[PDB]
Amino acid sequence: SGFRKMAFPSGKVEGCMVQVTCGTTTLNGLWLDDVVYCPRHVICPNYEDLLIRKSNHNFLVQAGNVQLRVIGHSMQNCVLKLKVDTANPKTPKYKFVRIQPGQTFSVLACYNGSPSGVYQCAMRPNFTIKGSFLNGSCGSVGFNIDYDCVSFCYMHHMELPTGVHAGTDLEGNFYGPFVDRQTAQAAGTDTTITVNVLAWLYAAVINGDRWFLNRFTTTLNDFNLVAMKYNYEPLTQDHVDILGPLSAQTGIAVLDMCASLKELLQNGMNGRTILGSALLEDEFTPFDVVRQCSGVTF
Amino acid sequence: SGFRKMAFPSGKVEGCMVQVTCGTTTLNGLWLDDVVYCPRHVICTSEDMLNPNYEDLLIRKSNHNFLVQAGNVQLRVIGHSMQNCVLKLKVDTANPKTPKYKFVRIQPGQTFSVLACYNGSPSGVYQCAMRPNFTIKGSFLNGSCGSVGFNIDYDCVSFCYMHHMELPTGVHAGTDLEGNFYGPFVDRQTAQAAGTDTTITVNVLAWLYAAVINGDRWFLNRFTTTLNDFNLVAMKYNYEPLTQDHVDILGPLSAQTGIAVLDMCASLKELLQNGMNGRTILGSALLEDEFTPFDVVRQCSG
Numbered sequence: 114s115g116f117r118k119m120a121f122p123s124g125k126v127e128g129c130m131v132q133v134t135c136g137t138t139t140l141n142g143l144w145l146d147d148v149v150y151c152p153r154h155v156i157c158p159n160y161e162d163l164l165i166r167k168s169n170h171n172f173l174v175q176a177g178n179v180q181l182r183v184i185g186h187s188m189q190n191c192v193l194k195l196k197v198d199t200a201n202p203k204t205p206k207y208k209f210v211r212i213q214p215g216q217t218f219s220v221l222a223c224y225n226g227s228p229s230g231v232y233q234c235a236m237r238p239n240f241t242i243k244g245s246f247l248n249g250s251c252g253s254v255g256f257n258i259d260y261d262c263v264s265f266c267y268m269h270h271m272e273l274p275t276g277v278h279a280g281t282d283l284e285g286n287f288y289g290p291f292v293d294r295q296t297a298q299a300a301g302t303d304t305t306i307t308v309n310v311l312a313w314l315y316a317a318v319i320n321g322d323r324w325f326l327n328r329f330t331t332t333l334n335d336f337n338l339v340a341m342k343y344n345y346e347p348l349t350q351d352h353v354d355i356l357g358p359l360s361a362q363t364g365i366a367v368l369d370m371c372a373s374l375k376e377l378l379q380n381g382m383n384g385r386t387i388l389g390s391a392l393l394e395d396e397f398t399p400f401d402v403v404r405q406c407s408g409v410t411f
Numbered sequence: 412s413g414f415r416k417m418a419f420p421s422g423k424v425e426g427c428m429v430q431v432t433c434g435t436t437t438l439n440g441l442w443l444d445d446v447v448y449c450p451r452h453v454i455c456t457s458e459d460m461l462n463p464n465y466e467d468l469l470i471r472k473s474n475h476n477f478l479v480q481a482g483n484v485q486l487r488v489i490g491h492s493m494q495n496c497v498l499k500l501k502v503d504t505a506n507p508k509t510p511k512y513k514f515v516r517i518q519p520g521q522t523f524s525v526l527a528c529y530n531g532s533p534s535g536v537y538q539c540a541m542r543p544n545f546t547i548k549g550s551f552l553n554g555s556c557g558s559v560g561f562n563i564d565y566d567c568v569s570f571c572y573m574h575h576m577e578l579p580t581g582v583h584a585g586t587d588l589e590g591n592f593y594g595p596f597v598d599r600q601t602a603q604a605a606g607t608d609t610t611i612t613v614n615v616l617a618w619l620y621a622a623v624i625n626g627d628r629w630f631l632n633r634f635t636t637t638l639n640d641f642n643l644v645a646m647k648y649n650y651e652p653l654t655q656d657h658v659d660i661l662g663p664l665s666a667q668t669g670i671a672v673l674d675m676c677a678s679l680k681e682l683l684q685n686g687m688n689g690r691t692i693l694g695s696a697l698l699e700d701e702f703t704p705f706d707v708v709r710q711c712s713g
């Protein structure tokens with residue numbers, strides 16, 4: 114029993130964190146095989162022009178107490194790829210994956226190439242992450258673990274004025290309409306990840322929290338009409354299908370749980386909590402719920 | 412033990428019934444807080460009924476045209492507005508007997524209790540199900556318009572139906588409490604017919620599980636079925652398709668009795684083919700479809 118916001122074990126990723134210094138700027142890099150990936154803003158904008166003025170020895174890369182020697186440099190979108198002489202012996206089996214909003218991932222927050230903490234995030238529908246970052250966290254990565262393979266899905270680049278965070282996939286493509294420069298940028302109006310709230314309601318049912326259940330059901334269209342009024346993401350037939358296993362395990366049809374959510378949105382919790390929360394939690398995907406309520410290991 | 416068609420206690424709803432009179436028309440209204448909800452056709456003169464322009468008829472009305480009576484007390488109407496096919500009469504007194512309530516729109520197959528009223532006075536309570544053709548097989552006479560359908564799960568009354576009309580087959584049509592009709596019906600005297608009705612398959616299976624919980628297994632068999640083969644057979648007996656949602660909903664009953672849903676489906680398939688052969692199931696010689704899976708669990712267990 115119990116339901117916690119749980120991150121993947123960070124060990125395979127910790128062995129990849131290095132410190133990248135370029136001039137006065139110090140941030141984090143991800144050392145995989147003989148390449149160090151880091152935000153291109155470490156050179157700071159005309160990034161092609163700033164990069165052409167740099168030499169390999171301008172980038173000081175530090176892996177623990179060992180200084181790596183940079184033998185090449187190239188830019189792929191908003192990520193800098195520093196070719197190093199040494200292949201990381203701790204390189205795990207990995208993939209670079211781009212995630213969709215609503216998907217969750219773990220973030221290994223680092224400062225000076227050293228991991229300080231790990232937390233679980235969700236890519237918000239407005240493509241920002243409500244992370245926890247201080248100055249020096251740039252280059253901290255977001256990942257998932259698929260059996261023994263680390264899927265890198267995020268690299269931290271910046272903080273928006275609202276305290277939320279923006280970054281890219283590992284191919285340097287930003288999540289959201291953000292750019293890596295000092296200019297007026299704002300996170301768009303956020304919405305609630307509906308499929309995730311339903312997944313979390315199923316987790317609450319599995320943990321014995323059933324007060325919110327009711328005898329009612331709803332049409333998918335009637336629910337989307339209601340959900341649109343509360344700034345909730347539309348629930349698609351894909352989401353309903355994804356929720357299938359949880360629906361089968363608890364005996365509560367997806368549209369049945371949707372009617373519980375409809376009443377919760379119009380009536381609130383009425384002094385009650387669900388999984389120790391007085392708010393509807395949207396940062397657990399249907400897969401996160403199944404994995405935590407089954408015990409999958411890495 | 413025992414399985415009865417059980418209605419919710421009507422007390423919380425009785426304290427909300429008021430009489431609404433507009434001209435020659437008298438029907439029932441539901442007094443919740445300082446609002447009286449009733450069918451908008453109370454403003455019609457029966458000569459309007461065929462093609463009524465409700466916006467046009469309502470604009471010609473004043474607050475003092477609507478006489479609202481709560482017991483022996485005449486309530487004062489201080490405002491009026493129309494929301495779909497329901498009239499909302501703002502009154503100068505909040506109902507002190509207003510219970511904790513919600514307005515819920517139900518899906519076909521769902522059940523609810525009906526508090527039948529005449530002249531703002533409750534005369535009886537019965538259990539009903541929203542038919543797959545969106546009609547209800549109620550028991551209503553003239554003057555029952557405005558009688559409400561509800562469920563009382565826990566201490567909150569969930570209003571799901573307001574009676575508006577009787578179709579030519581003796582079945583009834585009405586709306587949710589936001590004035591949206593169930594089915595393709597309109598509050599007009601025009602030619603309207605209930606579509607071909609079908610048996611609520613998930614409810615019959617729930618009722619077969621209730622029979623098993625009550626000690627009856629005569630109808631069970633050694634067979635199982637695929638969901639698709641059950642639906643092919645069920646369609647031929649005018650039964651609603653059973654979806655994966657229904658199979659999932661039947662999960663708890665299947666777990667409690669040790670009989671898999673598709674196993675129980677094979678038993679229903681056999682009953683459809685053979686009939687009962689002079690036998691009964693829960694005192695009925697017909698397959699009962701007005702108990703949902705939720706009704707069976709509430710009544711048989713708690």
Ligand SMILES: Cc1ccc2cncc(NC(=O)Cc3cccc(Cl)c3)c2c1
Nearest residue numbers: 452551552553575576577597598599600
């Ligand atoms: C005579 C009678 C008998 C039983 C009845 C049972 N329920 C309702 C009655 N009346 C109506 O249906 C009034 C009506 C007519 C046309 C359109 C609308 Cl929206 C309403 C009943 C009347």
Ligand SMILES: [Cl-]
Nearest residue numbers: 329330518521
């Ligand atoms: Cl329903």
